[PDB]
Amino acid sequence: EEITIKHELGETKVKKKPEKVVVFDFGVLDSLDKLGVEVTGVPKANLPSYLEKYKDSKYENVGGLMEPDFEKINEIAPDLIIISGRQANSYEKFAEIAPTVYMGIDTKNYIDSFANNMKTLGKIFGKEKEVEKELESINKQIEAVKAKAEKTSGKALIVLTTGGKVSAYGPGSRFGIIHDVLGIKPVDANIEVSTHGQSISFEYIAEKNPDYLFVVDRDAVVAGKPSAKQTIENELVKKTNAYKNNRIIYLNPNYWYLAGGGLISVAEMINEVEKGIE
Numbered sequence: 001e002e003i004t005i006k007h008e009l010g011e012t013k014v015k016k017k018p019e020k021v022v023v024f025d026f027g028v029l030d031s032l033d034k035l036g037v038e039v040t041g042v043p044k045a046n047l048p049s050y051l052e053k054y055k056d057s058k059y060e061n062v063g064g065l066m067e068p069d070f071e072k073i074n075e076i077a078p079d080l081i082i083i084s085g086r087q088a089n090s091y092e093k094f095a096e097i098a099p100t101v102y103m104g105i106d107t108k109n110y111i112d113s114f115a116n117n118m119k120t121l122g123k124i125f126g127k128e129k130e131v132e133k134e135l136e137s138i139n140k141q142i143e144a145v146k147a148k149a150e151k152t153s154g155k156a157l158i159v160l161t162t163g164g165k166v167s168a169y170g171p172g173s174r175f176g177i178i179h180d181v182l183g184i185k186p187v188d189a190n191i192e193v194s195t196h197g198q199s200i201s202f203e204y205i206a207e208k209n210p211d212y213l214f215v216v217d218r219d220a221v222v223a224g225k226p227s228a229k230q231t232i233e234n235e236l237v238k239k240t241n242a243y244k245n246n247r248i249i250y251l252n253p254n255y256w257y258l259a260g261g262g263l264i265s266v267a268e269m270i271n272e273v274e275k276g277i278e
Ligand SMILES: O=C(NCCCCCNC(=O)c1cccc(O)c1O)c1cccc(O)c1O
Pocket: 046, 065, 066, 085, 086, 195, 222, 257, 258
């Protein structure tokens, strides 16, 4: 029983319950994990800590997030390839091999895109109720943090560290869920939305003077070398409220940077926010 999927990059006809599934989005991979859905191929080179089981030799290595092994993908001859924003530009290449669905998060409507992505997996795999149950759990999660949020005021800044440099995310960004969904107040509400974040210096941080400084150590997951500490915790940063209040919250980059938009990653993401402000 074939079905047709509409997505940002077009329309794909897909066999229901495809036998061989290749996944280039870790959110999706953690969602299929979460659902008991079996995958064939993953890019093992960038696997998140929490998805380390997909290193097993039962799974085919199809390369890296930025470096798909196209020849290997061909030899697998998958029934479905699922990609996201990091591979958007290779859509045609993938679609040439096998039916390819694109599943990205619209950051203007994080939760709505998330839900539709998940519901599309529900459809493809016959997992509609399991999906709805998980969507419901995250909804209650949100409301709770949404209450805890409104309890207090105090403004938040979201930063990312890569090689001693630091860049910022605000509403509508890849990390906007903090502001947009969970109801934390942004220290700067008009931050130019950018996939690796608006470049800034410490001069900027110790100015907007946030109560909460959410940090994402990019180097921990792209270099394998955590830098987040030393980049951040320096004189000019330490002057802030957040360092004095011990509210510099290092967010887990395995979830936040390599893998969001999945049943597991979004639940975990929300929990790191909750704990961050309790
Ligand atoms: O278009 C993208 N990157 C192209 C430029 C990347 C230049 C090199 N990057 C890395 O080495 C790297 C490796 C693994 C995961 C990443 O996100 C990385 O950026 C991109 C899109 C959505 C999210 C991202 O994050 C991206 O990057």
